[PDB]
Symmetry: C2
């Protein structure tokens, strides 16, 4: 029954506070992606764990072309929930529909194109190594790469 | 189309490069063993991702997330999730996170097998500030 499956889930979670291991908070720990409002591609960041991890949803209308972008210090993850896409990672090209996943490792280039006439909807995560970023820099001054 | 996708990638070392599997079709991924799973992408120590399949009536008993953030994307089935003694129901195209320092369990409440794409991530700097990990890194 569709009425018993909430669109957003608020929940009280422990805070992982080193000083107070029993401290707690309310945080949104779940979303039904079809019902998420988005802001030529769509996205909404859903879960944020700054600075190490973030995740969200992207949708691409028919005939959409996402231009090549660098992953820089983040590893990208994409899970394809619906549609058809052709994706380039470092001049190697592949296409993929539902239940396919690909990663863009740090320091690489990627692009995505909608090759179907249904809109494509993706679950994305990006993550970075906070210790490594501190020791080597992010590519900004004075640590230009 | 392709089941495994290999690709030449730069290493973020600085121009060294590798051979690595950067894409999978989850239906063709072989699983391992209650529930079954396969680890797909590893970028030690900060990020991991994989696929889990629970059969009908399967229940993963409560375990702690400790210093890892876990996220789950539901490709098939219907589940009941307990995070910190609060339970909620979710189904296909739902995503949920298990924050650090909490207890969680997952139960299949449907008649289809459940399939999840999972990721777990950790804050390597914060872990170091807290004393987590030995000298063999």
């Amino acid at each position: 029954y569709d009425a018993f499956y909430k669109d957003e889930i608020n929940c009280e979670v422990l805070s992982w506070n080193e000083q107070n291991p029993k401290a707690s908070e309310e945080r949104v720990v779940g979303y039904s992606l079809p019902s998420v409002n988005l802001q030529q591609l769509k996205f909404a960041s859903l879960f944020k764990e700054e600075p190490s991890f973030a995740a969200g949803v992207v949708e691409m209308p028919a005939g959409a072309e996402k231009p090549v972008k660098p992953s820089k210090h983040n590893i990208m993850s994409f899970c394809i929930l619906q549609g058809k896409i052709e994706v380039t990672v470092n001049a190697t090209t592949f296409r993929m529909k539902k239940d396919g996943v690909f990663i863009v490792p740090r320091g690489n280039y990627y692009s995505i194109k909608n090759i179907g006439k249904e809109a494509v909807r993706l679950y994305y995560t990006h993550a970075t190594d906070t210790l490594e970023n501190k020791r080597r820099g992010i590519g900004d001054f004075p640590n230009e790469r």
